[PDB]
Ligand binder design. Structure first.
Ligand SMILES: CC(C)CN(C[C@@H](O)[C@H](Cc1ccccc1)NC(=O)O[C@H]1CO[C@H]2OCC(F)(F)[C@H]21)S(=O)(=O)c1ccc(N)cc1
Ligand SMILES: [Cl-]
Ligand SMILES: [Cl-]
Ligand SMILES: [Cl-]
Ligand code: NA
Lengths: 99, 99
């Protein structure tokens, strides 16, 4: 689709068997999701933000479905105020900014 | 143009006759730029992200060029880690997300 930016670009995702709403965020290098369980190994990470950092768990090789499109990549899990789909997974669904 | 997301979507902006680099950020409601001098009065605003909130100065009806496209609108100034072009000005330059 073509998504205008008059409102937040929110979409439905499927991750870990769960449906969630997430923000398509070209200003995010990586994907960050609110606390949930995911399978496999993880390692700690700090991720930056406009106001400072939060501690997250880094899970690699996680499959997500993003508005109907399957991707695989790293997902960070931690106390983000909103679920955000970052560039690491936006590239995989072929998302571009056009003007 | 059509901007892919394998790297950060950084463009040149021009504000107060100065060139700066800024990130095109669909996850930002608001344009926020690092400390600089802007004309006129400002109003207070609170904006929040990963790591919490920052206090910013809101300047309205500021002339800003973004990747060669003219915009005139609200610019927030504060301790953001990078200059961010948010949806309030992305809509003025006709940007959409596409996949
Ligand atoms: C700051 C920017 C360089 C990076 N961020 C992504 C942003 O898109 C962020 C994404 C974001 C969205 C919503 C809440 C938290 C973060 N938006 C944001 O801070 O926008 C602020 C300016 O306008 C307001 O609108 C949303 C806001 F946050 F409120 C304010 S981020 O959230 O800090 C971030 C950093 C690293 C990773 N991997 C993922 C995300
Ligand atoms: Cl990845
Ligand atoms: Cl104040
Ligand atoms: Cl505006
Ligand atoms: Na894994």
């Amino acid at each position: 689709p073509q998504i205008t930016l008059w409102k937040r670009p929110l979409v439905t995702i499927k991750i870990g068997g769960q449906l969630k709403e997430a923000l398509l965020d070209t200003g995010a290098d990586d994907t960050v999701i609110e606390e949930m369980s995911l399978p496999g190994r993880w390692k700690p990470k700090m991720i930056g933000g406009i106001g400072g950092f939060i501690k997250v768990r880094q899970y690699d090789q996680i499959i997500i479905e993003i508005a109907g499109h399957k991707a695989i990549g790293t997902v960070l899990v931690g106390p983000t105020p909103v679920n955000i789909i970052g560039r690491n997974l936006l590239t995989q669904i072929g998302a571009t900014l056009n003007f």
